[PDB]
Ligand binder design. Structure first.
Ligand SMILES: [Zn+2]
Length: 46
């Protein structure tokens, strides 16, 4: 698993709750909201 060896795979933002990268803040924030609330039935893994 290269795990980011060479290429284009980086973002100034990232979710330390699920593992989703974001190019901008507004984007990430608009997502982190899903965690603050009551997570659905599925992503309840890690
Ligand atoms: Zn997340």
């Amino acid at each position: 698993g290269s795990s980011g060896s060479s290429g284009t795979g980086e973002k100034p933002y990232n979710c330390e709750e699920c593992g989703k990268a974001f190019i901008h803040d507004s984007q990430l924030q608009e997502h982190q909201r899903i965690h603050t609330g009551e997570k659905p039935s599925g992503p309840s893994s890690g």
